[PDB]
Structure 1
Amino acid sequence: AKETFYITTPIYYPSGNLHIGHAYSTVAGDVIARYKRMQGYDVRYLTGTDEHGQKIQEKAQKAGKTEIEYLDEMIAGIKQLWAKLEISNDDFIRTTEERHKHVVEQVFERLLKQGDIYLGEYEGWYSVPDETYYTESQLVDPQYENGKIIGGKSPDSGHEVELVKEESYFFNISKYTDRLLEFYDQNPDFIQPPSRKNEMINNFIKPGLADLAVSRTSFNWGVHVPSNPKHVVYVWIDALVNYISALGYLSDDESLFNKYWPADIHLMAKEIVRFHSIIWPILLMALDLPLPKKVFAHGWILMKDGKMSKSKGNVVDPNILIDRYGLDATRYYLMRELPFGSDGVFTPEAFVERTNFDLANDLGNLVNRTISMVNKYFDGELPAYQGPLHELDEEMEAMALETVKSYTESMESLQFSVALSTVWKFISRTNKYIDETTPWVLAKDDSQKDMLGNVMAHLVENIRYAAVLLRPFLTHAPKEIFEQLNINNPQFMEFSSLEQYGVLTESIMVTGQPKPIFP
């Protein structure tokens, strides 16, 4: 059978609208999923929403809605967005779904029964502004009273923190320290880029791991602990187990779980890598479950001030971009302009340039010039490929194959912007091939009709290569290109058809009414 490949996004918190930062992760995951499907994997791609907690209670109440009314509306918007982006997710996990809650309940109860979790008191320091709790250890201007240790202000804002003490269950994660370090050693590529890992061990594991406060008593919107129902499961166990609950772990049908777990890649931005690289594998060990193969953290989309986030008032709505500039444009920009192991600032200027120059101009004009010439010189009848008949053809055919090879290396290493620039070098060279061969000159000489046909055949085959290579990235352009070229054989749309240049062995009638590929 096809090897399985399981990839996930984080589960986003719908306390406000999603922005291009969220779209970035989901489009990236989509490209990987689509690429892997084309490579012959049995793929499952998951995304979803983290729905519990006090903030959701608050948002719902201020809106005059129940928690579930509020959430249903938010999730409808999110699902619409992924539909609009043509995301190929196989499922969408909501933490309010029973399939999820049941796992949260069972995992918590199991860890209690095992003795990994025990009752105590959480002690933290809350800043209203930052919606963030801090430890005593990380407060700025720490105030003391004997002890103490009695107050201070946030390292982010400088706002005055307030003491929170409440009963909480603790997970003794430090027991697993040695096993976790052994795991890192056995799996050197578990944390990508490698930069992220060395921050993990130094900043967090060395001291190291404090018991993890895994429940709270101070809010009701969440999964209640069956054996102690005044406790609600806090974020750690609730949100993390989505990756296995969605697969029907501990349900009456665990077949997806038995197939796809462990995840091949968990994708995210850097601020949650620690949760996925430390807490998550430790929870899995406590559950005697295999660990994920790779945690991949991409960079941040920034604005002038700086990381894009709702609280900063600096967001760009992916709906607005898609509506104004088109889907291919929006997806192309996200994957080409930034990318993974780098942070990058969004600007509208860079967006329109990136997409006008590369898509409409380079690729769009290439396709339209080619089809126009086939209609003009051959009345629509594209001559079959024969061989490298022009003096430029041998080297260009070589370039086609090298393009595929380089592309593949880049895709395997998740360097999508490099993969894209490599495709564009080939698109650009194909436009140059028109300039160099001067088809119009060949069209004046009846003895050159065979050569003219050859030039046309090379243009179309080059275009076909680009189209196939772009299938993971662009969901509109490739299909449209095949349609206008009237390439119907589904095999000619797949990676295997790029192994030997010159696949088109029959005459084809291209469209007599070519129209712009973009937007």
Structure 2
Amino acid sequence: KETFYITTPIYYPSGNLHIGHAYSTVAGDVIARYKRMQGYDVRYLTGTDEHGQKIQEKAQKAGKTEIEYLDEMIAGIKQLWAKLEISNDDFIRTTEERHKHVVEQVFERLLKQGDIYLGEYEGWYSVPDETYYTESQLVDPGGKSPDSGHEVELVKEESYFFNISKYTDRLLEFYDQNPDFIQPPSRKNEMINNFIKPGLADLAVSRTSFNWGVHVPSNPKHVVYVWIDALVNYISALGYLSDDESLFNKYWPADIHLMAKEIVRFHSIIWPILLMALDLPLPKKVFAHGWILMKDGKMSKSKGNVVDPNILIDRYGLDATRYYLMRELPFGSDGVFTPEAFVERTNFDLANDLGNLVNRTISMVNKYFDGELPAYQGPLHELDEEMEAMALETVKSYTESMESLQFSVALSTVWKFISRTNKYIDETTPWVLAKDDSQKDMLGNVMAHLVENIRYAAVLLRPFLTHAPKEIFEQLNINNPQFMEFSSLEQYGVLNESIMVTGQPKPIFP
């Protein structure tokens, strides 16, 4: 079987994870499940970026040691992914020796090759802006930020520097060979002012001002700078430079690195250059989504302008939480959270459109045939040929949207099919057919189309929702695992033996 490897970013446990982090991890989970259903050998990784001054500060901020603070935070994150039913195959932590050893190895290798050299970084850090500046960029100079008005802090410390400019021609050559590397196309607007043409400055890849992180074996006063440390997670979790590299050679290069837009530059410039320096294959694709916003900007874990996903899961359930994120907030833009939109998505799309349809269909199969669904014969009603064609086009359109990670467009397309199946009841009028004994076949045909239409939706929603499709298969009494796969949607009319549906149809209530 063909392999597929997808990653989220390793999240910085500086606070509790909000719904933006949930979107990222659910989005990657949707693809993982989707790819497993297509017949790929999938590995899906997530994790925690546990080193840095920022973690060292947040442990200070919560008046506590480094490793005690983290253990408590990592427990909460694993509990969240458990509650979200994320099908991640592994959880990488940068504090683990399996990661650390590889970072140490990589860093000493770059040292041996001459790629890195000892020096001093001198610059101007704006405390509010969280961005470094040169002295010429300062306003009223020891000066003000050009972006804001806050005066800057002078930062001088020993640092290793990585000669990245020599990989410029190979990087530009890689972009030419892989013009669709960054998806969606709007996200390579993050590559504006990239400095590749005029010349990339040597990157400061270690700190001496703090001591929390991966220490450089040659010079332990230095700690490896957080971004090269963090990016190693994608290859270290597969056992790169360990005594078993079987996962690395099976899954690398990664098919998708998933993220939000603000780390496209890091994943598109620094990460391929690092891989080039190790003579490793480059990632296939970078998929970057937008931000969930509030009323004071992007949802931020250090700021606290957040919605806790535990609140949404506890109150409304898992399916409503997962559906809302994927449907309401498109991959290719930013989006505002509101409690209004959440209940509308929950009640109108899930409980009504899908939930009514299932209840209506089972109620009529119980009423007219005593639960005994007649087998699919063919498109016997005059509308069936178009509707069966629509079902096939729904799967094809769904596929196109899913391959480009347009999750809201895929779900929107699925919901047009669900709505049309509700309208199919209205315009066929089974209750009227049921009065005439001579129309029993047509009535059977109509019920058969309703059940098959529902099965199409349920299969397509398996990557998105973990409970409701399973609940739908149980009530309709589709036990065969074959009828739950994508391949069974390739031709309409799967159920050609009669089926007994449930006698006590409960609400699906997704």
TM over 0.5: yes
Question: C-alpha displacement at 1:108, in angstroms?
Answer: 0.4
**Cα separation, partners in 2 of 1:307 and 1:138, compared to 1, 3 Å:** farther
Find out whether 1:154 has 2:145 as its counterpart. Answer: yes
**Cα separation, partners in 2 of 1:347 and 1:159, compared to 1, 3 Å:** same
Aligned equivalents of 2:410, 2:24: Cα separation in 1: 17
CA contact under 8 A between 2:120 and 2:158: conserved in structure 1?
A: yes
Question: C-alpha displacement at 1:195, in angstroms?
Answer: 3.3
**Cα separation, partners in 2 of 1:32 and 1:120, compared to 1, 3 Å:** same
The more displaced of 8-17 and 393-402 is 393-402
CA contact under 8 A between 1:168 and 1:215: conserved in structure 2?
A: yes
Question: C-alpha displacement at 1:154, in angstroms?
Answer: 3.4
Question: C-alpha displacement at 1:312, in angstroms?
Answer: 3.8
Question: C-alpha displacement at 1:500, in angstroms?
Answer: 1.1
Report the secondary structure of 1:27's partner residue.
Answer: helix
**Cα separation, partners in 2 of 1:454 and 1:81, compared to 1, 3 Å:** same
Aligned equivalents of 2:419, 2:68: Cα separation in 1: 51
Q: 2:358 aligns with which of 355, 367, 379?
A: 367
Question: C-alpha displacement at 1:132, in angstroms?
Answer: 4.5
Question: C-alpha displacement at 1:245, in angstroms?
Answer: 0.3
Question: C-alpha displacement at 1:135, in angstroms?
Answer: 4.0
Question: C-alpha displacement at 1:139, in angstroms?
Answer: 4.0
Aligned equivalents of 1:363, 1:304: Cα separation in 2: 32
1:210 equivalent in structure 2: 201
Report the secondary structure of 2:136's partner residue.
Answer: helix
The more displaced of 9-18 and 304-313 is 304-313
2:300 equivalent in structure 1: 309
Once the two structures are superposed, residues 80-99 of structure 1 have per-residue CA deviations (whole angstroms, 9 ceiling, x without a partner) of 11111111111111000000
Once the two structures are superposed, residues 128-158 of structure 1 have per-residue CA deviations (whole angstroms, 9 ceiling, x without a partner) of 344554444554444xxxxxxxx22335553
CA contact under 8 A between 1:484 and 1:510: conserved in structure 2?
A: yes
**Cα separation, partners in 2 of 1:308 and 1:61, compared to 1, 3 Å:** closer
**Cα separation, partners in 2 of 1:28 and 1:167, compared to 1, 3 Å:** same
Find out whether 1:401 has 2:400 as its counterpart. Answer: no
Aligned equivalents of 2:341, 2:483: Cα separation in 1: 34
Aligned equivalents of 1:223, 1:140: Cα separation in 2: 36
Question: C-alpha displacement at 1:205, in angstroms?
Answer: 1.8
CA contact under 8 A between 2:184 and 2:404: conserved in structure 1?
A: no
Once the two structures are superposed, residues 219-269 of structure 1 have per-residue CA deviations (whole angstroms, 9 ceiling, x without a partner) of 111000001010000112100100000101111211100111111111111
Aligned equivalents of 1:465, 1:284: Cα separation in 2: 42
- Equivalenced residue count is 510
Gaps of 5+ in 2: none
Aligned equivalents of 1:94, 1:503: Cα separation in 2: 45
Report the RMSD for the aligned CA atoms in angstroms.
1.5
Question: C-alpha displacement at 1:58, in angstroms?
Answer: 2.4
**Cα separation, partners in 2 of 1:84 and 1:136, compared to 1, 3 Å:** farther
Question: C-alpha displacement at 1:5, in angstroms?
Answer: 0.8
Report the secondary structure of 1:125's partner residue.
Answer: strand
Question: C-alpha displacement at 1:446, in angstroms?
Answer: 1.5
Aligned equivalents of 1:282, 1:138: Cα separation in 2: 27
The more displaced of 459-468 and 27-36 is 27-36
1:26 equivalent in structure 2: 25
Aligned equivalents of 2:199, 2:483: Cα separation in 1: 55
Aligned equivalents of 1:401, 1:413: Cα separation in 2: 19
Question: C-alpha displacement at 1:430, in angstroms?
Answer: 0.4
Report the secondary structure of 2:39's partner residue.
Answer: coil
CA contact under 8 A between 1:331 and 1:473: conserved in structure 2?
A: yes
Question: C-alpha displacement at 1:349, in angstroms?
Answer: 0.8
Once the two structures are superposed, residues 182-229 of structure 1 have per-residue CA deviations (whole angstroms, 9 ceiling, x without a partner) of 110111111122333354264432333111100011111100000101
CA contact under 8 A between 1:108 and 1:237: conserved in structure 2?
A: no
Find out whether 1:377 has 2:376 as its counterpart. Answer: no
CA contact under 8 A between 2:365 and 2:372: conserved in structure 1?
A: yes
Aligned equivalents of 1:323, 1:137: Cα separation in 2: 52
Once the two structures are superposed, residues 309-352 of structure 1 have per-residue CA deviations (whole angstroms, 9 ceiling, x without a partner) of 13443211111111111111111111111211111111111111
CA contact under 8 A between 2:312 and 2:321: conserved in structure 1?
A: yes
Find out whether 1:6 has 2:5 as its counterpart. Answer: yes
Once the two structures are superposed, residues 84-124 of structure 1 have per-residue CA deviations (whole angstroms, 9 ceiling, x without a partner) of 11111111110000000001100000000100000000112
CA contact under 8 A between 2:15 and 2:302: conserved in structure 1?
A: no
Identity %: 100
Aligned equivalents of 1:274, 1:486: Cα separation in 2: 50
Question: C-alpha displacement at 1:161, in angstroms?
Answer: 1.3
Gaps of 5+ in 1: 143-150
Aligned equivalents of 1:137, 1:337: Cα separation in 2: 44
Aligned equivalents of 1:352, 1:140: Cα separation in 2: 48
CA contact under 8 A between 2:14 and 2:301: conserved in structure 1?
A: no
The more displaced of 269-278 and 342-351 is 342-351
Aligned equivalents of 2:499, 2:180: Cα separation in 1: 47
**Cα separation, partners in 2 of 1:134 and 1:12, compared to 1, 3 Å:** farther
Aligned equivalents of 1:356, 1:46: Cα separation in 2: 33
Once the two structures are superposed, residues 41-77 of structure 1 have per-residue CA deviations (whole angstroms, 9 ceiling, x without a partner) of 1111111010001222222234343211110110111
The more displaced of 127-136 and 212-221 is 127-136
Once the two structures are superposed, residues 405-447 of structure 1 have per-residue CA deviations (whole angstroms, 9 ceiling, x without a partner) of 1111111222111111111010000001111111111121222
CA contact under 8 A between 1:385 and 1:454: conserved in structure 2?
A: yes
CA contact under 8 A between 2:14 and 2:302: conserved in structure 1?
A: no
CA contact under 8 A between 2:289 and 2:333: conserved in structure 1?
A: yes
CA contact under 8 A between 2:377 and 2:496: conserved in structure 1?
A: yes
Aligned equivalents of 1:308, 1:380: Cα separation in 2: 49
Question: C-alpha displacement at 1:159, in angstroms?
Answer: 2.2
Report the secondary structure of 2:159's partner residue.
Answer: strand
Aligned equivalents of 2:207, 2:503: Cα separation in 1: 67
The more displaced of 236-245 and 339-348 is 339-348
Question: C-alpha displacement at 1:515, in angstroms?
Answer: 1.1
2:490 equivalent in structure 1: 499
CA contact under 8 A between 2:20 and 2:299: conserved in structure 1?
A: yes
Question: C-alpha displacement at 1:298, in angstroms?
Answer: 0.9
Aligned equivalents of 1:366, 1:246: Cα separation in 2: 44
Report the secondary structure of 1:60's partner residue.
Answer: helix
The more displaced of 90-99 and 436-445 is 436-445
CA contact under 8 A between 1:53 and 1:222: conserved in structure 2?
A: yes
Report the secondary structure of 2:222's partner residue.
Answer: strand
CA contact under 8 A between 2:401 and 2:409: conserved in structure 1?
A: yes
